[PDB]
Subunit: 201 residues, 2 copies
């Protein structure tokens, strides 16, 4: 395939396996038919983030990276994109500070929701967006927390769905795994990307 | 509309006006029919980025913003998304450092391409994605430069499209505006959301 041929493929609504997520933007990707695809909004994924069902758009050539599989629908959850811009910070609607913050070490008060790490500071939600560096000799490494811009994430919070995990002190360890992991929804099988050749070269 | 009715709308391939971009993810958004839409894939936008043509996906309720249009096509450029993940850093194909760095002040020899500010270090391209803050008062501000993950951007760079703007050295505080602003292309008019659609939540 070429970049042009990939971009010409039709968008496809189906389950893809071997899904990966960009640690900074939280975007989900997968390889299929020699092309790289990006999931667009409304996503249903398994508990782990191995498979996701939704509207996939071809964005370029497949990139190197990457049990069994049946024909029966499997359990999953409707996944929320924490940074989708539906409730942007620094606005009248969402007055939270729009600037990301830095932590020298992973904070003690974080909670895990749909495989993302979050912090709650009196109703202001932030999400872990990977590490960043500052300076040279020595290079300082920081854990970056970015203000959440997802209305659906805040709706869940305001509906009291994170009572067991968003108000917790922390310490000795890492994140509190929330009991709520989203609305249940099944993924059709098998993934269209099942075949091993979609994941090679 | 409701969040669910907005999500049930079909993806639309059309030109939208009153477009805005997320400074951190570089996402493009617009309001239409009481819903918020996000452009997916490569879009065609005007020079100022007021209008973009492409595949738009409904992601939630419309959000507050803050004569006119004809019916003949207008000139625009094929816009690339610098953080689209088609050529991720920290890999065999793209050996750039995968970590964003924080600058105490804007770096020197930067250039403007499609209203984004970039830095070029011996072929390693980095893009300005906004301010990050730290330190319980005073409150120190940093300028974040994130590794470019767009293969298209690198292709243009490698083909010598940025000859005049990306290869400066020395002391240059203001960014050089690149002559190349992308491949010319036309946008159908008028925009689908031209009418005062942009009012009342």
């Amino acid at each position: 395939e070429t970049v042009e041929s990939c971009l010409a493929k039709p968008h496809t609504e189906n389950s893809f396996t071997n899904v990966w997520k960009d640690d900074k933007t939280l975007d989900r990707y997968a390889n299929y038919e020699g092309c790289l695809w990006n999931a667009t909004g409304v996503v249903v994924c398994t508990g782990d983030e191995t498979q996701c069902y939704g509207t996939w758009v071809p964005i370029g050539l497949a990139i190197p990276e990457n049990p069994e599989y049946g024909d029966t629908p499997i359990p999953g959850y409707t996944y929320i994109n924490p940074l989708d811009g539906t409730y942007p910070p620094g606005t009248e609607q969402n007055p939270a500070n729009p600037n990301p913050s830095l932590e020298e070490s992973q904070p003690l008060n974080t909670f895990m929701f749909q495989n993302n790490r979050f912090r709650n500071r009196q109703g202001a939600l932030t999400v872990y967006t990977g590490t960043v560096t500052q300076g040279t000799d020595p290079v300082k490494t920081y854990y970056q927390y970015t203000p959440v811009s997802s209305k659906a994430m805040y709706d869940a919070y305001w509906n009291g769905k994170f009572r067991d995990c968003a108000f917790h002190s922390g310490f000795n360890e890492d994140p509190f795994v929330c009991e709520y992991q989203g609305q249940s929804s099944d993924l059709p099988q098998p993934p269209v990307n099942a075949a091993a050749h979609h994941h090679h070269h």
